[PDB]
Structures are given as structure tokens and as C-alpha cells.
Amino acid sequence: GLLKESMRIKMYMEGTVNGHYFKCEGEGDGNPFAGTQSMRIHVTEGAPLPFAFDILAPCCSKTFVHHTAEIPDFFKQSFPEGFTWERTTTYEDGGILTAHQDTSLEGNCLIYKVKVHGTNFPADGPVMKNKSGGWEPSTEVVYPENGVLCGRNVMALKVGDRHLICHHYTSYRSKKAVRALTMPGFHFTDYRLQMLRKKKDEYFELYEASVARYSDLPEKAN
Amino acid sequence: MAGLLKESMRIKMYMEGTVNGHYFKCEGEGDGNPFAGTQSMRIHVTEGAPLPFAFDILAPCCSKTFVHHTAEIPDFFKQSFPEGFTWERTTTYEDGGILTAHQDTSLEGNCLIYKVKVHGTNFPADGPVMKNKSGGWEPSTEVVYPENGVLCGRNVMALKVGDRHLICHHYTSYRSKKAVRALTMPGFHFTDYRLQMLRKKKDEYFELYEASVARYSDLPEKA
Amino acid sequence: AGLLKESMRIKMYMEGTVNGHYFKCEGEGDGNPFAGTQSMRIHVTEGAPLPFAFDILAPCCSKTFVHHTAEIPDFFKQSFPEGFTWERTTTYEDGGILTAHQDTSLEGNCLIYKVKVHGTNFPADGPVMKNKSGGWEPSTEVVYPENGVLCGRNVMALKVGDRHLICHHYTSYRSKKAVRALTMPGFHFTDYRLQMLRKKKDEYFELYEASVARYSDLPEKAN
Amino acid sequence: MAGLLKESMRIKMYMEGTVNGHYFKCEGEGDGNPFAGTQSMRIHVTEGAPLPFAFDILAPCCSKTFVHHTAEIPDFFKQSFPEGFTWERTTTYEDGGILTAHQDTSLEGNCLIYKVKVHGTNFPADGPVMKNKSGGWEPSTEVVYPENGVLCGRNVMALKVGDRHLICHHYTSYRSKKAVRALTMPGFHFTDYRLQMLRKKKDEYFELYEASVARYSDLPEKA
Ligand SMILES: [Cl-]
Numbered sequence A: 001g002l003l004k005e006s007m008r009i010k011m012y013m014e015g016t017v018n019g020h021y022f023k024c025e026g027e028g029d030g031n032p033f034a035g036t037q038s039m040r041i042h043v044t045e046g047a048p049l050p051f052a053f054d055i056l057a058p059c060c061s062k063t064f065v066h067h068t069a070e071i072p073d074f075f076k077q078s079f080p081e082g083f084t085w086e087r088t089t090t091y092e093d094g095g096i097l098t099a100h101q102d103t104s105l106e107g108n109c110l111i112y113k114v115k116v117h118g119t120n121f122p123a124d125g126p127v128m129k130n131k132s133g134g135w136e137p138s139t140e141v142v143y144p145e146n147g148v149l150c151g152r153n154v155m156a157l158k159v160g161d162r163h164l165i166c167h168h169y170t171s172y173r174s175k176k177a178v179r180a181l182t183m184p185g186f187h188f189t190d191y192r193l194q195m196l197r198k199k200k201d202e203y204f205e206l207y208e209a210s211v212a213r214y215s216d217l218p219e220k221a222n
Numbered sequence B, D: 001m002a003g004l005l006k007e008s009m010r011i012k013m014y015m016e017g018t019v020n021g022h023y024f025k026c027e028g029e030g031d032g033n034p035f036a037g038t039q040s041m042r043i044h045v046t047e048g049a050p051l052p053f054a055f056d057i058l059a060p061c062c063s064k065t066f067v068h069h070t071a072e073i074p075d076f077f078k079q080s081f082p083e084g085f086t087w088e089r090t091t092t093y094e095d096g097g098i099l100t101a102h103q104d105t106s107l108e109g110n111c112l113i114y115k116v117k118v119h120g121t122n123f124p125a126d127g128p129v130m131k132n133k134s135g136g137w138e139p140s141t142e143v144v145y146p147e148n149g150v151l152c153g154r155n156v157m158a159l160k161v162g163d164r165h166l167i168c169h170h171y172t173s174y175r176s177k178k179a180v181r182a183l184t185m186p187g188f189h190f191t192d193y194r195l196q197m198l199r200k201k202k203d204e205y206f207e208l209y210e211a212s213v214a215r216y217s218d219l220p221e222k223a
Numbered sequence C: 001a002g003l004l005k006e007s008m009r010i011k012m013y014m015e016g017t018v019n020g021h022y023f024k025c026e027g028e029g030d031g032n033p034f035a036g037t038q039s040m041r042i043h044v045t046e047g048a049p050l051p052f053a054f055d056i057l058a059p060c061c062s063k064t065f066v067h068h069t070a071e072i073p074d075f076f077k078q079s080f081p082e083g084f085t086w087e088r089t090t091t092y093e094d095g096g097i098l099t100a101h102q103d104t105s106l107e108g109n110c111l112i113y114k115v116k117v118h119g120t121n122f123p124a125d126g127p128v129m130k131n132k133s134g135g136w137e138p139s140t141e142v143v144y145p146e147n148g149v150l151c152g153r154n155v156m157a158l159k160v161g162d163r164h165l166i167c168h169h170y171t172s173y174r175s176k177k178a179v180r181a182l183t184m185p186g187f188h189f190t191d192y193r194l195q196m197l198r199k200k201k202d203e204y205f206e207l208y209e210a211s212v213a214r215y216s217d218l219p220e221k222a223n
Helices: none
Strands: A007-017 A020-031 A036-045 A083-091 A096-106 A109-119 A138-145 A148-159 A162-174 A187-199 A203-213 B009-019 B022-033 B038-047 B085-093 B098-108 B111-121 B140-147 B150-161 B164-176 B189-201 B205-215 C008-018 C021-032 C037-046 C084-092 C097-107 C110-120 C139-146 C149-160 C163-175 C188-200 C204-214 D009-019 D022-033 D038-047 D085-093 D098-108 D111-121 D140-147 D150-161 D164-176 D189-201 D205-215
Touching (some): A007 A036, A138 B164, A162 B140, B009 B038, B085 C110, B111 C097, C008 C037, C139 D140, C149 D140, C149 D150, C163 D140
Parallel strands (some): C008 C110
Antiparallel strands (some): A036 A203, A083 A096, A148 A162, A187 A203, B009 B022, B038 B205, B085 B164, B140 B189, B189 B205, C084 C163, C097 C110, C139 C188, D009 D022, D022 D038, D038 D205, D085 D098, D140 D150, D150 D164, D189 D205
16 A cells, blocks of 8 residues: 555645745545545745635645546556646636646655745735635536646635635646546536635645546436 | 326427528427426427428427426426426527527427527627537536526536537526416426437428436535 | 718617617618718617616717728628628626627618617626716727638727726627628728717717728838 | 946846746757847756746746837846846646746856746646647736836737637846846836747757846827
8 A cells, every 4th residue: 555544645836826926735534545635834934824725725736536436546646656736716706817837745744845826916906905705515527638647627615605616627647647647527526625724824734525426317228 | 287288298399590501490399397407309400401400409409398407406397387497598508509488388288399590690600500510419417506586597507529529508488477476486406417419300390309407416514 | 983972871679678778769870881880879779778887888889980991892881882790709808708690771861770689697796787987998909801701809898987897898790691692701800999979868879989990000021 | 338237148047937837947048139029949858857837927038138129118127137037927827837936047257147946836727728729828918017126027929729719928137146236227118028929849958038128108198
């Protein structure tokens, strides 16, 4: 078992949102097979963040997805080489956040290097006014395109009693040769990302559960 | 299930529109169980046949009265009757197509009446839609949430094209024709769909089957 | 030579929905096709008072009236007597999307416009739905051929107090003449200044527009 | 024009990034007249040569100090010195590619120093960028407007591919490193550009020339 039922996580993230530079460091832990994980994040440069960390939380880990129904596991198959991902997230009120990430494995420790770039968040919107209240659960659509795994997702940011919708466009690339990977079929991945604590716009505690699965609806023969 | 909506309902659908300058009209005859969330429909292109594009793009225009609602989720669509409801959609395809739709849903005794108008443009002339090379839809999960008396939907849809998929994006709004005070809005939730094309002939006759369920996420919440 | 005159009549029939709100309106206008200037008076006959800013409909209301400089071939004036159509998607950076399609025909000295609009997802508290906008800045469209179809892209800026809300035009213009019967222009620009001169009770609007097709004014270097 | 900024300035540029996973670094030396709005630059690819993609997508990353300002439009960029300014851009290509850039502009005596970091992805493997089959940019017209103390820009760019064009869209923000209270913001205006690639060798050496002018619309405004 190259992955253990308890893993450490170390994350290094930097970037800008509406021109505001930040750097933070995360340390976390999780069970890759149960699909559960947590992370503590400290903003070491650019604190206090003048925007909602909610927009950075989904940049902070698909080794920790519980795979059901024998769905091949693109991410766990990628080790020891690891994998990368790229995402564009569009917010319906104008914000755009791109991110790219490198995932590597050193012994018991997964290591994440993330670069983010957010632009055009409206100055009076809930992101820049820092008035959001976490994410709803979501369900990602996942499917192969050659040797690359593609993802699409609708996410809903809680803003008071209403929602601000954004759209995920993600590509996951293995550092293993496509020859040595068994790609999944089309499937879904459920997520529930929770922010358990936040302090002074410089400290955040995350928890995430994730499950890969097929549609629950029966398929009518004909 | 003994009142305005019963365990077996009939459906009549009238659709017309233009896609990439190609005019057509369709009529649908269908039936289903609105409480079990299952339904079928037989569609005949009555004008503009053979369709010079994949009927797949029109199938999701062809019925949310037939959603099985779990976990006591308020049912926006069933609550709307006898008056009924309307819906509108903008769909964007990642290779350029854009399809817009207006729909009205009315009741006539045991029969639901659907009146749909669609407009599509910018579908690539050599893409799978205009070349009629798609292979039906994958199942999907819509995000459903209220916004000031209106029900909103968002969905990622995946059209099968050989071994690959072409992605499109639904932006849907649902409006009741009942007075606003008489409706109990749901909260944020999901609706699963599986839309299947069971028969097609001559780019003129199509047969659909659909199951849908409204529900919350199955994932536990960490306290 | 001929067909179009120094003064033309314009009649416009427009209908559609914005955020579910249906409206119909009728315009009568006039202009000088060769000077590139025109005006229109618009009466909302159904759905008044409009619960949204008519600014978003004003660019749906006429490219026969573009002054063509530097001998740029005139796709629109060449299209008569047959006429032409256009299709546009406009995305607003705060979420709105407005599609429209239009038919342009010519009868005597009267240009006849038939427009259909479908706007969705305008934010309920944004300046469009709150009716708080203050007209358009001038703009410069990019215009270029793609196999007999004329394409257009434009950045538009809606004035909201002392700020701007940006939207993006994606336009396609199609002639009803055969491809062989008309000379396509090359890549070029079209300047616009659309002004709303009067508005009353969200049911009556007066437009004025000036437009010029031209090349970049910047010199071209050596190589 | 005898103080910090003179009629002849030098430029040194440092650029690095990855496009579709391909790492590169390049260095530029340039010069120009910031008041007349003309400049040139000779670029060497120092890492990752030969570039496996069209350098055209990087040329607009390679200088707003050299904009000729007309009609007394306040000059956000020249006002920022000696401290300088930064800019950021997101560019979306209609065939799928996306390019992001961060840039810092500083002053060293008579030399402007540019530090650029770029990230591009989703360019189609068979597209004109990754297959290196593009042919330079058309001229363009940027829309420039203030939002608080930040200058915003939007632009439609048209890359020549044979006799056709691939469109992309600029979303640019410009931020001054001089104190906010020391800045006179412009109003809404336009900036014309013409960026020309006068020389290229072995996908490793490139020569650019650029002219740009800030102005208002040429169209008269109505009573
Ligand atoms: Cl706190």
C-alpha cells in the first residue's frame, strides 16, 4: 500500500485576488480510502485577506475520494509519480479564478503546490466584501478525454439566504504514462466541503468528504 | 394522489422552433406517473422532417411535474396546479451552440399540456449536433434553489459523441402561475435525471423515457 | 446606385422576455443610410411598464444605416432588395445573458425589422432589473468575414452612476443574397454612438444612433 | 519630457511561464518614444527554444507607458512613475485557450524594467496556436475605464490564421504603485493599438513594433 489509511498533507499556496497578493501554508490529514480529510491553513503573507477565503477553499485534494462500484481511481493510480490539476472557476457575478496545482508524494506525506489568480470580483459583491457563508454540497461530472480526466461542476456559495453560483472547469493530468493507467468511465463525484473555523481572515480550518459513484437512478432496458 | 394529479397522467406537447436557420414543428404524446417520477413520450416531427440535426438537443425540452420528491422537499411544480407553471432555459454548448427555450405547462383534466418554443444558433456546421452524430445523454444532477419567488436550476449535461462527450450547460428558471403567497418554496437541493432515447426513425419519430428524483446530498455533514 | 434613398422609413416589431417578463413593442423611425444616422420612436404595447432598463433592448433596435468610409464593401446595403438577418448573444459581466435574432426586409422606402429577444439571469438587484442604468458609452465593433457570413464582436459599457457595467456582443450577419452576388469586406471596425434621447413611464423611448465603418487610424510600420 | 520620462527610453523585459505544460523563459530589449506612443522590442527565448507554440500569444504581454495620450486624457501610466505600476490580464480564446499574466513595471534611470509571468492552458492541440500557424494580430481598440483607483481594460483581439481570424478577449487591470491620493484618474476612453511582428527566426528570436493612442470616440454627440 503506497497510500496509508492515515496520511499527512502539506500545502503551499500563493497568488493574487483582485491584485491582492497572498501566501499561505496548510497542514492536514485524512483517510484517502474513506474519502475524508481536514486542513489547517495559515495566511503568512497578505493577511488579513480582504476577500472571502471561501473562494480559495476548493483549491486546497482528490487523493481523498472514496471510490464506489469499482470505479477506476485516476488519482490513487497516479502514485508514486503523482498528478497535476488545472481549474478555471467562473462566478456568475463576474469573478474569475484560475488555479493550477502539483501533487506529489513523499513517504506518508502528500505535498500540494498551488498557484491561484482571481480577477474581476465585483468590489461590492459578497466575495470582496467578505460576506459569504460557505459552500453547499456539490456533485462533479467526471469523464475521460484521451489520457486526461475532465471535470465539470456547479458550486453554490451561500450569501445570506441566497446563493451565488459558480462553474468549475477542471483538467486532471497524471504523471504516470497513460499506458500504465486504467481510465474510469463517465461518473459523478459528490463533495461536501465545510469550513469548520476561521479567525481574523488569516486562519481557516477545512473538512471535506468526497465519494465517486454512478447515478442512483435505474437505467431502463428498453 | 386522487385530486388534480393522479398516479397516471397523459401528456400532449407542441414544440416549434428554428435551429441554425432550420425550421421545424414537433408534436408529443406521452404518459407517466408524476409521483414515482417516471414518464415517456413519443414525438413526431410534423414540419421540417427529416430533422437536419441531432434530436438529442431538443429532448431536454420535452416535464418536471414528473419528479419524485424525497425527504419532504416542497414540490414547486405539483403545488402549481391547476394554474400550472412556465419555464425558460438558456443552454450553452462548449463547442459554440446556444439553445434557448420558453415553455408553458397547463392542465386539461388528466392531461398535461406543454407548449414549447425553441431557438438555436451557432452550432458548428461540422460538430456532432449539425452532423447528427450524437448518442444520447448521460444521466445528470441539477442544482435547484430559490431566488425571490422563482425557482432556479443549473445543470451540467454530457452529450455522448462516440467514445467522448460534448458538454453543455443549463441555466433554467421556473415560474408558477399560482399567486406567490400560495406557494411553499423549497430550499437548496438536487434533482437527478436519466433521459433515454429508446427509439428513433427517419429523423422524424422519437421515443423518450425519463426518470427524475429530487433529494439532498447523500453525504453526511460533519458537526 | 438606387434602391436606398437619402431618407428612409423604419418600422420595427419587437417582442420577447427578460427574466420571464413578456413585452411587445412597435417602433417607427427614419434615417439617412449613407450618412450613417437614424432615430426611432418605440412604444411598449404589451408588458408596460417595463420592469427592467430599456437600455438592454436599445442595441436590438439597424446596420443599413452605417456610413462606410475608405471604400469598405457594405455587406448590408449590398443585401437589398433581398435583405439580411442577424443573430446576437450578449453576455453581461454581472450575469445577464440576452440573445436576439432579427429579420431585415425592405418594402418601398420602408425598412422593416422583426426582432425576438430572450434575456435571462439578470441579477434581481442589479442595475438592469432595478432600472438604474443611464445609457451606453460609444463603442467600436470588430467586423470580419467568415465564409460569406459577416461576424461582429463588441465590448459595450452601460453607464451605472459613475461606474460601468461591461457586456460583450457576439454577432452574426447573414445576407439573403447568394454568396456569389456580393463582395465581402475585409477586417474592419464600426464606431457606434447610441443615445436614448427621451424615455417616459417605461413605455416610450426615443433612440438616436450614428455609426461609421472604417479602418484603424494608426499607420502601419515598414514590414 | 526632460524629467523621469524622456522622448527616448530603453526597455528591458524578463518573461517566464508555461503554455500547455511547456516551460519557457525569454528576455527582451526595446526602446521607444513614450510620448509619441511608439516602441520596439527584440526578444530572445532563453529557455524552452524552439517555442512549440505561436509566439503571437505572448506578444501582447511584452508596455502602456508608450501610449500617446490625446485630448488631455489623464495618463495613468506616466503619472505612476518613479514608483511604477503593475498589470494583470486574463485572455480567453474562442477556441478554448486561456492565458493569464502578471506584470510588474519599474524604472531604472532611462530604462523601463518589465517582469512578466504567464500561464496558458487549454489551447487545442490541433489549433493554430499549438500548431504554430498564426500570422500576427490585427489592430485593436481597447475600452479603458476607472473602477475606484484601478484602471480597467477590455479588448477584442483578432489573430490572423490564413485568411480567417481567431478571436480572443482581454480582461486587463492596471494598478499604480504610487500613492492613491497622488493619481488623477481618467474617464472612460479608448486606446488604439497596432502590434506588428517584423521579424521571427527559428521560434527563438522575435522583433516587435507597437504604436498606441489613447483617445475618445470620433463620433459627434447629439443634442
Ligand atoms: Cl475573527
